[model samples]
Target: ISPPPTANLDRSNDKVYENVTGLVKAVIEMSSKIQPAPPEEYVPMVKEVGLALRTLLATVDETIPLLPASTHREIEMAQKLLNSDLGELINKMKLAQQYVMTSLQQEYKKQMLTAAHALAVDAKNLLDVIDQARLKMLGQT
Candidate 1:
């Protein structure tokens, strides 16, 4: 007797989940330490983490279709969050650096600071979303 088609999909999804989990783990490990306040100190870190995130975004897009229907949409949502948030964070970091070095008007500096905080918070939230998805996927396995 042949096994059900869903059995194959489940195994495929499990493997994809593991891959996504590992990628997310790497991102969190690098991104968690990134801070914008001490702008000078974190430039390299932001660049590295930003590059990693872009790469992961590409991977996520490619892998999304391979994931099980039950969980793929949530996973894709997380990927979209990371993709947009990380890019915003990188831009904010650049603005912060410019604010520090250029003596750009206080009003502009205030804006940068506000965005810096918001961007970081958004990035962290994206991480939480990915983590929750990871947990849910693992639970199903």
Candidate 2:
């Protein structure tokens, strides 16, 4: 038998996790400061923030619950994401920029966010549906 072959560990898989974590980290990093508001000013704003967070968190809950998983699907989707010709990583980053910036700016009701969120949600929902259907198909239950 020949010498043991090298294990091929693809960093792109790690990079997907890294990219998501980094995007969230960047969001937090950008929000290092809390804007101080007068209590009168704050109450309504805080209420909206709570409501938005609920919407935000619920969006996460409503979305991911629909997406189940399997080894076959994970590998297939990961392969799609990893492949250069597919440009999955780049597309994801562009969507991430839209998501982070839109939510950040929209907390202040800037009009730019409508377009931004549209783009962000479109791409995100695309990828999410891709993964979700792939997983569910593989899950076959």
Candidate 3:
């Protein structure tokens, strides 16, 4: 169990919260836009989501040590989701992105769209876990 925070300061935890939440929304937006968006616009959107995921991953690492052990454990479990499912998604996205940059071929873009949709699903799954963990961390007097 985690202890309630008292006399809080720094607010670094706030940063992590933003990334975790933003990542989900960004993934959703990117997935929706992938197919119909022009190739010119598509890559930028994918790259934006990629950047948000990277930031969230970094923030997860940053916040782990600052949390209670049980809270850390929960967060770590979610982190594992990133290491496995999210990692594959990102890797697939990178390949898709490379193909986009080098050649805007329809086949590669279709594969990219498929991967982005999968990422959105995974992000939704992880978002549930993250929110559950966040609820456990909420402030109370």
Candidate 4:
């Protein structure tokens, strides 16, 4: 009396991880482009970044239920960190777009860049947690 085959679960989990990795790469690339963009472009670019972050969040949420029960707490912690980073990134991007003063806008842009970098780092951390969980679940730990 067992559930689905371990191989099947492993494959599905691998696919989700791959998707997350790709999404994280996309966000990083987009954020790099934003650094040199003109002020007029900030709002649209930030909106695009927001959408990507949301998609990444949704994918992370989907991954939670598929992870091993034993690893859930660690994965959830990673998820929370990622979520916090995302929030910071979005808030900085918003401030960058909201200000009319060139100096203030530039200051916010710098902050946004830092936030984006933090997001990338935390996203990678979350992926590492997931990878570890997968290994443990497969008895490869």
TM-score of every prediction relative to native: 0.46, 0.25, 0.56, 0.74
Clashing pairs in 1: none
Candidates in order: C-alpha RMSD to true structure: 10.0, 16.9, 7.5, 7.3
- Give per-residue CA lDDT, model 2, range 45-118, as digits (tens): 32342343334333343444345543235434433332332233234334444545344523442322233233
lDDT of each: 0.51, 0.35, 0.59, 0.67
lDDT of 4 by residue, 18-121 (tens): 55565566566656687678767766655665666677667777777866888889877877876787688778777776874566777887788787677667
Q: Against the true structure, whose lDDT is highest?
A: 4
> In model 1, which regions exceed 4 Å deviation?
1-41, 101-141
Give the better candidate number (1 or 4) by TM-score: 4
lDDT for 25 in candidate 1 is 51
Ranked by TM-score, the better of candidates 2 and 3 is: 3
lDDT of 1 by residue, 1-141 (tens): 111122223344443334434444544444445433366556765566556556545655675454456766666675666567656656666666666645563444454345444444444444444445555555645
Model 4: colliding residue pairs: none
Candidates 2 and 3, the one with greater lDDT: 3
Best by TM-score: 4
Clashes of each: 0, 0, 0, 0
Across 74-93, the per-residue lDDT of candidate 3 in tens digits comes to 56666666556555555555
lDDT minimum window of 10 residues, candidate 1: 1-10
